[PDB]
Amino acid sequence: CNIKNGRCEQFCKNSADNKVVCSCTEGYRLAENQKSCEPAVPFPCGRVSVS
């Protein structure tokens, strides 16, 4: 997780074999690429949607 947060968009945790596991806050799901965080609800926390 040392450099650039292990490429996790939100949270990183060091696992084993020098691998990394990403995770996301409530209202988001870990995306397919296992790094990015996708919204799982209509109005997820912390985002501007008015534009």
């Binding site: 939100q10 949270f11 109005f43 997820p44 926390c45 501007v48 008015v50 534009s51």
Partner: protein, 235 residues
């Protein structure tokens, strides 16, 4: 907020205003549909208070406003353990009826203790509110916001005779002119992480506002995120 700029509607959809025996006396942030986080010094008494979410201009009607009554107030249990220190300046407000989430009414994210601190240390956060736009001056009609840099602990320690606890941090500019102020307390200090904003501080106290050589003092939210999550559970 002294030296900031007008927000756009929906730019800070987690921001709320508190109204009571004084209108627009403090700010807060939406934790979830039933819970607001604010400063304990805003809610010391237990007089009746109301919360307005989806607020932008406090003298006009946007038709985005949601007004709620506060039915329970939980100041942090260590607030006022020591008189006049502002240590543990954080409180939670339970609403009578759930907010309806939408583009103007959205919670702020709250990370664990570790990542909340990580985000704070990125070193640049936004503060917002309807507080005074000059020290000892008038309050804002339109929601103000300001980017403030994190200030190193030694610098902040030297800036004031008052004690800066580990539960606090300092933010602002060496040259002054830009700061949170009275009326802004309880509002958020937030850090944007790849388009997602996280709560990193609560607007708490200072010496005057925007004076050169002084900084805004904020409650360090990382130290309280476990407590926030425990008390605001929905079931």
């Amino acid at each position: 907020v002294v030296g900031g700029e007008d927000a756009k509607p929906g730019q800070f959809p987690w921001q709320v205003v508190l109204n009571g025996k004084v209108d627009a006396f403090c700010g807060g942030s939406i934790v979830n549909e039933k819970w607001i986080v604010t400063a304990a010094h805003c809610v010391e008494t237990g007089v009746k208070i109301t919360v307005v979410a989806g607020e932008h201009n406090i003298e006009e009607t946007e038709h985005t406003e949601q007004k709620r009554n506060v039915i329970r107030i939980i100041p942090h249990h260590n607030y006022n353990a020591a008189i006049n220190t502002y240590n543990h300046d954080i409180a939670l407000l339970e609403l009578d009826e759930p907010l309806v989430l939408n583009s103007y009414v959205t919670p702020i994210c709250i990370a664990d203790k570790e990542y909340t601190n990580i985000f704070l240390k990125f070193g640049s956060g936004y503060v917002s509110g309807w507080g005074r736009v000059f020290h000892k001056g008038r309050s804002a009609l339109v929601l103000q916001y300001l980017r403030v840099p994190l200030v190193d602990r030694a610098t902040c320690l030297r800036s004031t005779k008052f004690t800066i606890y580990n539960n606090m941090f300092c933010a602002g500019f060496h040259e002054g002119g830009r700061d949170s102020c009275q009326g802004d307390s309880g509002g958020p200090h937030v850090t944007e992480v790849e388009g997602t904003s996280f709560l990193t501080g609560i607007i708490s106290w200072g010496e005057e506002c925007a004076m050169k050589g002084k900084y805004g003092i904020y409650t360090k939210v990382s130290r309280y995120v476990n407590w926030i999550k425990e008390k605001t559970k929905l079931t």
